[PDB]
Amino acid sequence: VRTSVLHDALNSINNAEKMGKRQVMIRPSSKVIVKFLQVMQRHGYIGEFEEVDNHRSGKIVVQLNGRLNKCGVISPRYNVRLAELEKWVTKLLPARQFGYVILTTSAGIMDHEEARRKHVAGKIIGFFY
Amino acid sequence: GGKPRGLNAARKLRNNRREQRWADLQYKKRALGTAYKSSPFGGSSHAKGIVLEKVGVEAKQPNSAIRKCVRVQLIKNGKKVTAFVPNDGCLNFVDENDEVLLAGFGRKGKAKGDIPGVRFKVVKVSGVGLLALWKEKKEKPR
Amino acid sequence: GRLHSKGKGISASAIPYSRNPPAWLKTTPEQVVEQICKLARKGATPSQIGVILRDSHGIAQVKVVTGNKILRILKSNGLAPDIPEDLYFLIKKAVAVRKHLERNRKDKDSKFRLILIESRIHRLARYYKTVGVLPPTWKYESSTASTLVA
RNA sequence: AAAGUUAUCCAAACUCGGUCGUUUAGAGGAAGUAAAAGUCGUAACAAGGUCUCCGUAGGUGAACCUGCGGAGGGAUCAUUU
RNA sequence: GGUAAUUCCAGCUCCAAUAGCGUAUAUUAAAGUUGUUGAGGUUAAAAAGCUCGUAGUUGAACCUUGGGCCUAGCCCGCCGGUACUGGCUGGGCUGGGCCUUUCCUUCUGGAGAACCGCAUGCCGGUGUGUCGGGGAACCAGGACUUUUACUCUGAACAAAUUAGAUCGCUUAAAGAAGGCCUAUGCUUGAAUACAUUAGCAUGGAAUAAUAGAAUAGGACGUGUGGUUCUAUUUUGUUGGUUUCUAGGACCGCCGUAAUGAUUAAUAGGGACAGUCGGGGGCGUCAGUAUUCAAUUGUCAGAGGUGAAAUUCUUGGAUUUAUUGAAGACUAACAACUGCGAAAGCAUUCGCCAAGGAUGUUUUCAUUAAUCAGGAACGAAAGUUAGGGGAUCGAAGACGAUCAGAUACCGUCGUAGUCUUAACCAUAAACUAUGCCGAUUAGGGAUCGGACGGCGUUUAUUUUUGACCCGUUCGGCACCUUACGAUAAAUCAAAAUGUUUGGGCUCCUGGGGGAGUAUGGUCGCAAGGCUGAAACUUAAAGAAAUUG
RNA sequence: GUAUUGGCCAGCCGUGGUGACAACGGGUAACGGAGGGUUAGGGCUCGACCCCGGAGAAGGAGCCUGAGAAACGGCUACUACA
RNA sequence: GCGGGUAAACGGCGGGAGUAACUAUGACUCUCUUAAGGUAGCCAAAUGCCUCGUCAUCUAAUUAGUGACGCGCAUGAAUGG
RNA sequence: AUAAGGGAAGUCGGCAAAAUAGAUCCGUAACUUCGGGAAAAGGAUUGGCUCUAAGGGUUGGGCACGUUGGCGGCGUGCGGUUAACAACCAACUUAGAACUGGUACGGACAGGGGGAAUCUGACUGUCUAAUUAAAACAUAGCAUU
């Protein structure tokens, strides 16, 4: 049965980019995905996203702007120290000058390069470049 | 593919590794400690023994020769094995009752080359060392 | 896709996007309760009462007009059954097959089939006890299961 | 106040039995591996000249045969009112 | 290496390291050949025969966001001047204050600033003073707050060792020394960070769990009775007593309030309606065929093989017709068609219980997925007692072929092949492909249900049945193609994997020895389940290409 | 009773305690730790041995003196050596 | 009398030559003979003359006892193993 | 009937004799037709006197506000369940403790020796009265006419 709606949504997006379409549907809505979309949106990796509504889980629809590569997710919620972040950015990122790992902290769901500025840490959820 | 991946599932990963570790051949020989119990050498590198007789061993198919082996009985345990003289015309340097010293062939248990089934070789005789006699840098004690 | 089978089905029922009673019904909630109670007194069960109330006259969905569910209404009027409907109906199947087995001793498939019913019954009963609907000593002895039915 | 002596306690050590663990002696029996030139047939690889293989059961100097039920990893992806 | 040796034994020459080089054993990297990061499981080693289910692992969505003002600290861009200095209402990042239904608990005590009025004084202001009134920053003291996981910052925790700063032991490994002038002298260092799990404090409140009002046994009141207990200091002193008073426990009446229950998941269960199927059990009906028997009619070889031969015959073989008995089995219709968890399941009717899909503005509300041990079923052959024993047919006897033939070919024939009551639990039990969930390409056929439509067909007809066109849900399959995969054969999954993490269980680690020995356990036995080592070997193996 | 607490011991009375989150038992060519060897990261392996802690003086037991010993370059007895 | 059937009916279940890379033996072959030529098992056994057979164990010493070996004068399958 | 020291050296052969023996409490192997072997093997206690504890039966409660009857029996109506009392009656069986003795105590009688194996018959049973009780006979099971 469905066990990670965040992974399901990200998987649908990746298919479209490698096949070249411009639109994807997402069946389950949640705060975590919707905030996750915003982190990319503030960097331009995605376009405008529309949220429909019904008294249910709720669908989402965004149209893909291209210029997007692999965006994955780490299913077992690990625990990250503030010192053991260079290990993760070395682990899964094409290069140092760009790309983003996304964490969850008590200060909200956010990413690195600002967690370093805010001196915060938490758990890992995904990445996108 | 097919591993357990949950967060509170370290026990299963530990259990599978310890169990599946036994199918490995190199590791399993260490854990059970067969070499100490079974090998003619009790985990050591060299040993000393006394010579019983001189024997000739036939090579395998493609080659053809007489390999000039020797019969030895170890002092530690008293077991009897066969040892390959490793040079040219040394069977005139070893006589009966000469208390030789033995080493291995460096294949860690198996036989090397064509010789059918001998795992040791003579390094010393009367405490002089073979190569010394060959290059006539010394003489045997009288 | 399905608990005790090898097939999947999606023959569900879609609930409309309208939390307001249709204007043409023009029926008050106060009168609604009595007929529901009427059928319960004659001997019906909450599941089947709804289909007559829906089919025969008016209300398609009780919740919008009333604000509460049929079981919630009945419980506040002290007509709720002791044992929940789902648990009750399963037992009715288990008893009948038992009677069949004692005459037909060579019906191997039903013996396999019988295993399924109580396994479902046992699994469902565990949930009821931990939430507080059933007393923590109810056990469903296979011998006296007939007494529980009636 | 010494030798001695009465009754408990802590107990080395010895005898006999029971159980567990380690090493090892043996008339005789049944095997496997290597070194092949031997001796008797030709089971398998082609429709290997009886298509091959699996489970079970009996038989036969030896590879092997036959009965029952399967499989194609076959020598057939195929035959019409 | 088998008579001109690139490889042996020697001379010359050359190569590598160098005061050192070789050999044996153990251990690490090489090893993504132990794989959490990160490894195979269609054919190369490997998915349990199938299903149920406990430990254990994992589990759908949903409850305070946004906007409007003020301010600080830091970086970059710009101008200009002398590394230094100022400016942009510059652009940002971090933080702190108020308002929007949100502000942020409370009591006692301490000292005291800013804002205020007085006058001795000076140039709209201030020290003045034991002048006095507010609410707020700090400190001390007391009471109250869902609980764990997580992360930040603190405290405490040997020396040696690790990383690392300084000093020319003549350099270095080391050492903690040293440095300056001329000096009866001066001066320095012997630093710093980490360990990381458990325990003690502090800030954070996303993420993952957990409790709260439903037969109200719910919250508040300086509203108001009551019944129980504890008892400060004040009435000279003590003892006993009482009123008032201060506090605590229990329980009524009245008042206050928007009086307390999330959606109904292309999660799951159950109910309801019309259908659907060679799903299962018990009884029952029918069908030819085979063998035997009875009646009936004739006249010579008949059966069998590549070809012979056994065997049977005027006590009439073989063939013909009618009738009867026995046991097994339901041809043709029958198919890239159905049902079941698999093994498997095909004649009629009656009875008994069960199931999927479909339809649905019914119902409960997270009740779910996979499972170590554990359990039910489990072809054929085989075992123990009866019944039955037509046909085929292990063992076996005869006839042929053959050099032999314990076989392949022929005539018989025992156990068995059937059934009742109990055992056994293995198969190439094969899709050689575990189960649940999401996404991804075009097509036409086909089975079941539902929906829409112009027509046809024949019906005490009309609705309906049946044929045609189309849409949709759920299955057994197929054709073209690769954007993808693999070593390839090929694959709509064997794809979405060096750009590697949806969830859970099982199995394998070069080939033999070996599914053997020993131990345990189940079985009347045959056997099943679990399951090694010594020793030996440089290849065994998969897919495809040319002969 | 000991310097003191305690099923440490003596009497009377209850029936309990641990376990698949692996108890109990068996093997270790096992003293523990600070640490050594080899490296992208994650690890694998060794640690009798100069520092800290524990135990022993052939094997077992028993004791005097003293603040401190079940001491062995202290004593008593048995075992095995001599 | 001639011809078939019958052994859980009475009973029976043999000799002789060649041979495998020291030797030795003989899986295999050729030969005489009748109805067939002792299969699975067991043994100096209450059944073996030669015999106090040969090997191991028990005792200081064992013609006795037990476990093996088997061309067994003359073991052996309802005369049941 | 008894005998020091030795304990089968006697003899064809442990023939005859000796040793163990009751009851209570512990402990008990190989093998197996799972019923047995099993009293396996092997250990400890046992008197007298003075005490303690446990194991039962019968009869009343049982009340009140009236009733018929010679303080009492019935025919009433109700209540109430003594954290169960009081009186009387009667034998034996089991368990615990102290003291005591020339360490003895089933004090006479009564009263199993045991273990490791081989041959042979499955077992209970029967026969040569007056020399042979066995491996002989019979038996259930199996098979044939």
Cα dihedral across residues C121, C126, C128, C129: positive or negative? positive
Spatial distance between the Cα atoms of C70 and C63, rounded to a whole number of angstroms = 8
Spatial distance between the Cα atoms of C47 and C84, rounded to a whole number of angstroms = 11
Q: Parallel, antiparallel, or unpaired for β A100-105 and A71-73?
A: unpaired
- Which residue is listed with tokens 């331009």? A44
Q: What angle do CA B64, B67, B69 make, to 5 degrees?
A: 155
Nucleotide of closest approach to B32 (CA, C1'):
F27
3-state secondary structure of C64: helix
Spatial distance between the Cα atoms of C10 and C14, rounded to a whole number of angstroms = 11
Report the gap between the CA of C71 and the closest CA in chain A (Å). 22
In terms of Cβ atoms closer than 10 Å to its own Cβ (0-12, 13-18, 19+), residue A1 is exposed
Residue of chain A whose alpha carbon sits nearest to that of C1: A1
Q: Is residue B56 a contact partner of residue B67, using CB atoms and an 8 Å limit?
A: yes
Q: Is residue A26 a contact partner of residue A7, using CB atoms and an 8 Å limit?
A: no
Exposure string over C86-96, b if 16+ CB within 10 A, otherwise e:
ebeebbebbee
Q: Does A77 touch chain B (CB under 8 A)?
A: yes
State yes or no: chains A and B have 3 or more CB pairs below 8 A.
yes
Contact, B5 CB vs strand D, < 7 Å: no
Spatial distance between the Cα atoms of B66 and A48, rounded to a whole number of angstroms = 87
In terms of Cβ atoms closer than 10 Å to its own Cβ (0-12, 13-18, 19+), residue A44 is exposed
Query: Hey, what amino acid is at B49?
Result: G
Identify how the structure was determined.
Answer: cryo-EM
Token code pair at residue B28: 């399993």
The reported resolution of this PDB entry, expressed in Å, is: 3.0
Residue A46, Cβ neighbours under 10 Å: how many? Answer: 23
List the subunits that have 3+ CB pairs under 8 angstroms with C: A
Spatial distance between the Cα atoms of A124 and A89, rounded to a whole number of angstroms = 12
Q: For C107, phi and psi rounded to 5 degrees?
A: -100, 80
What's the N-to-C CA distance of chain B in angstroms? 71
Spatial distance between the Cα atoms of C127 and C133, rounded to a whole number of angstroms = 9
Nearest in space to A45 (alpha carbons), one of A69, A29, A76: A69
In terms of Cβ atoms closer than 10 Å to its own Cβ (0-12, 13-18, 19+), residue A9 is buried
